[PDB]
Design a protein around this nucleic acid. Sequence first.
DNA 1: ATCACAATCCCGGTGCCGAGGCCGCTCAATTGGTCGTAGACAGCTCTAGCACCGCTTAAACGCACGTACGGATTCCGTACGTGCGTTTAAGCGGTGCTAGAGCTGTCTACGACCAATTGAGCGGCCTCGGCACCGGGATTGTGAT
DNA 2: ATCACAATCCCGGTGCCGAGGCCGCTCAATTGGTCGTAGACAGCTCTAGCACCGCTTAAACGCACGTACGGAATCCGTACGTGCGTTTAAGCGGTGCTAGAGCTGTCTACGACCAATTGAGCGGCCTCGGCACCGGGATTGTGAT
Lengths: 98, 97, 79, 87, 105, 103, 96, 97
Amino acid sequence: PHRYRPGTVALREIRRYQKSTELLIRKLPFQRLVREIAQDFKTDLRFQSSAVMALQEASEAYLVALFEDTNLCAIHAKRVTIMPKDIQLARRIRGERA
Amino acid sequence: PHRYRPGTVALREIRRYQKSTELLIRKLPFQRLVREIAQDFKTDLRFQSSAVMALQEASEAYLVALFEDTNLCAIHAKRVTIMPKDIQLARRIRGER
Amino acid sequence: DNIQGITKPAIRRLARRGGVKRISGLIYEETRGVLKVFLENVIRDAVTYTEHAKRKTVTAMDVVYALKRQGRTLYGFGG
Amino acid sequence: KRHRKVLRDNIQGITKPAIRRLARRGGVKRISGLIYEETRGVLKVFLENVIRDAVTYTEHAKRKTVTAMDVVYALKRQGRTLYGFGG
Amino acid sequence: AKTRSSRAGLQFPVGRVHRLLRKGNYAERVGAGAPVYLAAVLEYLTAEILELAGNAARDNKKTRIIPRHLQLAVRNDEELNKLLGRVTIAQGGVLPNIQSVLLPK
Amino acid sequence: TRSSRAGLQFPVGRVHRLLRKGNYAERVGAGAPVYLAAVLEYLTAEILELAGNAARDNKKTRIIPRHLQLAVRNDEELNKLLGRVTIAQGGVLPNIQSVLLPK
Amino acid sequence: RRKTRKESYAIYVYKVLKQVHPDTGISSKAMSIMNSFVNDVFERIAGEASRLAHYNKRSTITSREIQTAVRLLLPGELAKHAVSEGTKAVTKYTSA
Amino acid sequence: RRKTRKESYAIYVYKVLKQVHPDTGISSKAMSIMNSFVNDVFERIAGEASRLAHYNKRSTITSREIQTAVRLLLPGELAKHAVSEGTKAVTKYTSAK
DNA sequence: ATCACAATCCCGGTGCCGAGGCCGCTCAATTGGTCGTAGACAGCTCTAGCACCGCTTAAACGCACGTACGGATTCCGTACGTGCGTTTAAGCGGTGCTAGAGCTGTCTACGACCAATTGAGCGGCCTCGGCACCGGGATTGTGAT
DNA sequence: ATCACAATCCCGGTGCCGAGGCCGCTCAATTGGTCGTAGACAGCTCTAGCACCGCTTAAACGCACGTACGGAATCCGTACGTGCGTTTAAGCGGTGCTAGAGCTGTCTACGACCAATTGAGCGGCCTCGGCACCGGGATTGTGAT
Ligand SMILES: [Cl-]
Ligand SMILES: [Cl-]
Ligand SMILES: [K+]
Ligand SMILES: [K+]
Ligand SMILES: [Mn+2]
Ligand SMILES: [Mn+2]
Ligand SMILES: [Mn+2]
Ligand SMILES: [Mn+2]
Ligand SMILES: [Mn+2]
Ligand SMILES: [Mn+2]
Ligand SMILES: [Mn+2]
Ligand SMILES: [Mn+2]
Ligand SMILES: [Mn+2]
Ligand SMILES: [Mn+2]
Ligand SMILES: [Mn+2]
Ligand SMILES: [Mn+2]
Ligand SMILES: [Mn+2]
Ligand SMILES: [Mn+2]
Ligand SMILES: [Mn+2]
Ligand SMILES: [Mn+2]
Ligand SMILES: [Mn+2]
Ligand SMILES: [Mn+2]
Ligand SMILES: [Mn+2]
Ligand SMILES: [Mn+2]
Ligand SMILES: [Mn+2]
Ligand SMILES: [Mn+2]
Ligand SMILES: [Mn+2]
Ligand SMILES: [Mn+2]
Ligand SMILES: [Mn+2]
Ligand SMILES: [Mn+2]
Ligand SMILES: [Mn+2]
Ligand SMILES: [Mn+2]
Ligand SMILES: [Mn+2]
C-alpha cells in the first residue's frame, strides 16, 4: 500500500489552509443554521445573500482565531491535542465565559 | 516552637485579602513610580492626588484580575505554582500580548 | 439537526487554518455549541436592527452593525 | 528654579510582599521566584499606556496638572472604565 | 403636577435628562418621550442595584452602603456583572473564590 | 477645490460635510476636515503601499483582500490599529507552532 | 468664592434608596460609584440611540431609539424590565 | 433602467494607489475593504475628537482636536507620520486661502 | 545516507468576465455675503499640589531551614490519524413567481427656538449616630505527641 | 485516637467625623406661542430573495487498521514557603510656599447659514488583459531500505 506517519497529512493541511482564504464551512448548511437561529428571534424573515456571507466570514474568522488560542492552551499543558478544556480556558480568558 | 506547613499561611492570606478592599501596594512607592513614568513622557507635571489614587485603583485591579487568569493557566498545566509563562499565556489570549 | 450540518471535516479544516495538528473527539460538539452562541449573539443584535428599520429582510448592514457592536468589526460588506 | 530630586528605579518600590498580596487577592497560593520582575514589567507597560493618554488629555486642556478626569477618560479609552473618581 | 417627572411618575429628572440629550450631539432633534423613557430605565437600573447592595450592607451588619456592597451586589448578580463587565468599582475588592485543587486534601 | 489648495487626493469637501452631518459637535473648524482628510489619505497610502508589495511578492498585479491581510498582519502598528477588525477573505498568516514540527 | 455648582444624581439616588430600603444609608464613595454608574449607562444608551438614528437617516432621537438602545445594551431580564418600565413612563407621560 | 446613488472613497483610493504603486491595480472586494477601512478610521478619529470637545466644554472640533484624536488613537510611529501630513496639509491650505 | 514514490510546485497555453476607462448628466461642493457668538486672551483669586522635617512603628528585607512541589523517567492502553471504498447532499445553472425593499410627493404633528416665570437643586452650615479601632475572651483548626 | 496553641472570630466600649438635614438664594426647568421641516402615511416601481428541479461531481461518511500520544505511576533534587531577627522607610500631621486651576470680562475672528453657481463624482456602457483553471513535466520531501 502506502501510509504517511500520523501527523504528516495534518501538517500538509495546515500549510494548505493557512495558504488559502476561501471559506471552510459548506455554504448551505451554514445558511440553514443562520435561518434556524434567527427564527427563534423573529418569525418570517428574509436574508440578503450578502448578509449570510457576512455572518459566515465573521463566524469562521472567529473560529480560526479561537482555535489558535485553544492550541496555545494545549501546548501550555505539554499536549499536542486540543481538548474542550483548552477551548473553555481560552474563552474564560477572552472573557466570553465566566 | 511551632511551624505551619507550606501552603497553610498562604491559604489564610488568600481569604484575608479577598475579604478586604484596601490598596495592597504602599502609596509613596506607587506614586514615585507614577511621577517617574509620567516625567519620561513630559516634564514638570503635577498630579491631583486622586489622579494617583485613580491609577493605583485601576492598577491593582488590573493585577488582581490578571493574577486570576494567570492562576487558571497554572492549574491548566497541572500546577499550583504560577510562573512567568502563565502570565504570558493569559496576556496573549487577552490580546494584550 | 441543522447544527450538525457544521460537520466534523468542516470543523477540522477550520482547526487546520488555526494551526491545530491533533484534535480530541469531544472537540466537534464543543465547537458546535460555541458557534451557536456566537451566531445567537450576533443574529440577535442583527434582528434588533432589522426590527427597528421596520423591515422583514436582514441586510448585510444589520449584521455589520451587529458585529461592530460586539467588538468584531468586519471589512468588505458595507463598513 | 529649584531642584526636583531625580527619580530612578522606582519600579522596585513595587516590592516582593506587595505583589504577593495582590496575588493572594487574585487567589494565588504558590508563586515562582521569577514572577516579581515579570509583574513589574506588566505594571509598567500598563501604567505607560494609561499615563500616556491621561497626559495626552492633559496637554490638550493646556494644563500642567494631571486630573482624576484625565486618568478616568484614559482608563475608559483603554476599555478599563473606573467608577468612583468622577465621570 | 408641574415637573415632567411627576407627569411621568418618576424620581429621576426628565428635564435634566432632556437637557443632556440635547447638549450631547446625539442627533439634531430629541423627541419628547426620549428623556422620559431614559430617565425611567436609569431609575429602574438604579433601584435594581441599590436593592441588592442594601441587602449586602445588611448581611454585613451595616446601615450604610459602602462601595464593596455595590461590588458584592454586582458581581453576585449574573446580569449586573455583565452590564458592568469592563467596569472597575473603586474600593470594592473581589469575590471570595479559592480554586479547588488549592484546597488541602 | 479645497483638496488641491491643501495638496490632497482625498476630498476635503466630503469630509467637512460628513463631520457636520455626523453629530460630532455644534461647529467644525476650517482646518479640521483638511487635517482629517490628510490623515485618511496617509493611512490609505501606508496600507496600499504594503498591500501592493504583498501583491508583488505573490506574483500579482492586482490587489485582493489577502494582500491587504498580509500587509496588515505583518505590520506591527497596522495590526495593532486593526486588532479588532476582520478583513473579509483575508485568511491568516502561515505560522505552525514549533513543538508540532517532527524531529 | 462660594464653590462652583457641581451637578449630581445624588438626590435621586437617595430617593430611590429610601423607597427600597428606607432605613439604609450611603457613603461618599458609594454615591460617587452610583453617580458614575448612572452617567456610564446614560452615555451607553444615548450613544446606541444616536447610532440607530444615524443608521436609519433620522434626525430625531425618540423613545423608540432609546427602547432599541436598551434592547441591544441590557442583558435579557434587565432589558425586559427596563423596557416595560420605560413604555409605562411614556404612556403615563403622553396622556398627562 | 435607472440609477440609485451611493458614495464611496473608491476614486481617491485609486488616485492614491497610483502614487504609491503606479503599475498595480485592485479588485472590487479589496476596494470594499479599503472603503470600510477609511469609514472606520474616519468614525474612530471623529468620535474621539467629539469626546475631546465635550470633555473640555467646547462647541468646536478644530484641527487641534483631530490632532489629539490621532495621538490617542494611532500607535506611535503611525501617529508621528499622521500628525506631520495633517499639520503639513493644514499649512499648505491656509497659505493658499 | 541512498533508495524509490507519493503529493506539491511551476510553467506555458486558453478562454472568460470584471477592472478600468470614457461619457455625459446632475447634485453636492464652491464662492461670495451677512450676523452672532465661541473662545482667545488678560487680569484676578485662592485652591491644593508640593517640599520638607521629625517620630513612631509596622512592613520589608535577608537569612536559615526543610517540606511538598515540579519535572524527569518509564510505561501501558486506546484515542487518535491515515486510507481505503461506498453514500450523499452541496453546488450550479435553470426558469418561474412575487414579497417587500426602496424612492417620491403630500402635508401636519412635533420639536426647535424664544422670553418671562419660578421653584428644584445647589453650596454653606451644623451635629450626632454609625462605625473604625481596640482589647478581651471564646472558638476553631492545624500540627505536635 | 488525644492535646496544646496560634490565629481567627465575635463581643461591647469608646471616640472621631462625615452622612444627611435644615436653610435660603439662584439658575436651570417650566410655561405658552411661533414657525418650519421631519417623517408618517400613501402610492408605484422593480430588485433581489426565494422556490422547486435534475444532473455531475467532490465532499461526507463509515469503516479497518495501528501507532504515537495522553495519562497514570513513581522517583529525586531543590525552589519556594514559613519564621525569625535586623534593617528600612511609609505614614502621619503639622507647617510653610506658590504654581497654576479655574473663573470673570472684553471684542473679534471665525463658522453657521442662505442663494447662486459649476464641475467633481456618479451610474451606464463597453472591452479586453489579468488571472483562474488545467494538464503534463520539474522538484521536493516523506518513509522505507
Ligand atoms: Cl419621543
Ligand atoms: Cl480648525
Ligand atoms: K491648585
Ligand atoms: K428586494
Ligand atoms: Mn526619567
Ligand atoms: Mn503561468
Ligand atoms: Mn467599475
Ligand atoms: Mn467629464
Ligand atoms: Mn464664552
Ligand atoms: Mn507532583
Ligand atoms: Mn442557483
Ligand atoms: Mn406587495
Ligand atoms: Mn414599503
Ligand atoms: Mn404627521
Ligand atoms: Mn410642541
Ligand atoms: Mn412622536
Ligand atoms: Mn448639597
Ligand atoms: Mn484586637
Ligand atoms: Mn486580645
Ligand atoms: Mn460590636
Ligand atoms: Mn452631604
Ligand atoms: Mn442630623
Ligand atoms: Mn426649601
Ligand atoms: Mn423628508
Ligand atoms: Mn507522552
Ligand atoms: Mn530531577
Ligand atoms: Mn504609624
Ligand atoms: Mn501629610
Ligand atoms: Mn501665578
Ligand atoms: Mn490661566
Ligand atoms: Mn470666516
Ligand atoms: Mn462608475
Ligand atoms: Mn496535472
